[PDB]
Amino acid sequence: VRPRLIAELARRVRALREQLNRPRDSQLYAVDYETLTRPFSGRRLPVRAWADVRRESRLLQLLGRLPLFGLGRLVTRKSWLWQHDEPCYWRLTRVRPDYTAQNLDHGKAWGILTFKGKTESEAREIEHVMYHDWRLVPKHEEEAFTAFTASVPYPPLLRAMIIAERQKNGDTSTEEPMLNVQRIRMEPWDYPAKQEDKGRA
């Protein structure tokens, strides 16, 4: 068998150069509010977020106006609070801005979160930080804001199949068979996701 070396050499060199001089956070997050197109990509923005990108600002721009980017300060998911009335927030624990940014308007930061007043015991990370959809809540109006408070039949064919099965078995079992649904954790769309799973250019 003939081995090949230049292929692995090029793989190594490309990985090294990528990790070395990949485009920067702010560089690839920048947007021109007039044309609504990200530089380095030439892609247009979605119509639903055109207005948000025109009017509203970004999370790090909100956080740059207060010391230490406001550890423990009240920032809420505007999308969550428009999709539902209940309060939802982010117990931001760690923060790191990008040094190449001029206004320090980009970076990575996260901590514990809460959905519908349901806290979790893990400092898991944010979802969609770089959007123009972020709203900061002051230290006043905090407690009033953070205040918060069977089964289904089977399909007809499936239940008929089970009826015939247990009739062949010999037990009548007059009860209609059902499954559990309170166990099923049907989660809303907007429950966040992990960043390490999704890649980056």
Binding site: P155, P156, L157, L158, M161
Partner: protein, 116 residues
């Protein structure tokens, strides 16, 4: 052919000449072509009626349950066929299509009553 990632998916394969489709529900990878290779030929469907008028379809219940327990996603037309069968829940888009057709038919009958 080892595909990058992908997943098992039961979907429709097309057979027969033009203007005579014959669908085949069959398990395969997400990345395979339409009539590409498969794993197990599960069931069939004919969208045209027979001499009696019936439209035929065959489903392999135990094997389909085995494949779902192993893990395989469903395509919208085949899961719609399953919902029509009743082994599977009915489709919300089908409900909406029926409701829209009924709204349109009521509107047309109203327009006809206005014209007459």
């Amino acid at each position: 052919k080892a595909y990058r990632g992908g997943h098992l998916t039961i979907r429709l394969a097309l057979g027969g000449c033009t203007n005579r489709p014959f669908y085949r529900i069959v398990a395969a990878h997400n990345k395979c072509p339409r009539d590409g290779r498969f794993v197990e030929q599960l069931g069939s469907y004919d969208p045209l009626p027979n001499s009696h008028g019936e439209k035929l379809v065959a489903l392999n219940l135990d094997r389909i349950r085995h494949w779902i327990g192993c893990g395989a996603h469903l395509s919208k037309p085949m899961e719609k066929l399953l919902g029509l069968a009743g082994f599977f829940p009915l489709h919300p888009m089908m409900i909406t299509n029926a409701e829209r057709l009924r709204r349109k038919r009521a509107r047309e009958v109203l327009l006809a009553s206005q014209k007459t």
